[PDB]
Design a protein around this ligand. Structure first.
Ligand SMILES: [Ca+2]
Ligand SMILES: [Ca+2]
Length: 200
């Protein structure tokens, strides 16, 4: 087949808010989305996963955890997750600080991806083109000390999470894995996949 551009794939296959947030994140760290293109696509993917992880999950009027797929939820419902990723550094730490003072949870040394109000913990999400156990160990060894929960997804459907605790129901994680499969398949049809996989 013909080789497509990863730029084209990213703008066609991710929603514009994700793409924009990804561009902003790369600029913030001095990376150009038009050169580190595989990285661009990885950052978009990771962002989307963070959003999909939190999608639909609320804490009900009584304070337990429920799933609603409407577009208009009950306005007394609280979002189960805070989303830290996608925010610029100042706002990300502002949110982390607010969570920590309120819930009294310990302050992390690096910005995590999410906060889970049900489980009362920060979450580090990862999406890897390699084996989940290796990526898992890399992440665990970076965070130094841990209350932060780690949840790793791969493009082939494997997961690994701290203490074999996967946080979400199978259906939610299936949505995410289905999306990752679709990303991989679409990259493959544009002949972008083998390279994307090898660049991590
Ligand atoms: Ca980030
Ligand atoms: Ca992050």
């Amino acid at each position: 087949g013909p080789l497509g551009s990863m730029e084209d794939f990213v703008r066609q296959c991710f929603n514009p808010m994700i793409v924009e947030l990804a561009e902003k994140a790369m600029k913030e760290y001095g990376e150009d989305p038009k050169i580190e293109t595989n990285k661009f696509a990885a950052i978009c993917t990771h962002l989307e996963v963070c959003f999909m992880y939190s999608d639909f999950h609320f804490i009900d009027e009584r304070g337990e955890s429920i799933i609603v797929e409407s577009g208009d939820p009950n306005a007394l419902l609280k979002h189960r997750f805070e989303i830290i990723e996608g925010r610029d550094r100042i706002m990300a730490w502002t949110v982390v600080n607010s969570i920590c003072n309120t819930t009294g949870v310990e302050k992390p040394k690096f910005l995590p991806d999410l906060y889970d109000y049900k489980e009362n913990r920060f979450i580090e999400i990862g999406v890897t083109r390699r084996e989940v156990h290796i990526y898992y160990l890399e992440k665990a060894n970076k965070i130094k000390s841990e209350k932060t929960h780690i949840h790793i997804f791969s493009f082939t459907g494997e997961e690994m999470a701290t203490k074999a605790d996967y946080t979400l129901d199978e259906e939610s994680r299936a949505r995410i894995k289905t999306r990752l499969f679709t990303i991989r398949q679409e990259m493959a049809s544009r002949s972008l996949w083998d390279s994307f996989r090898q660049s991590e």
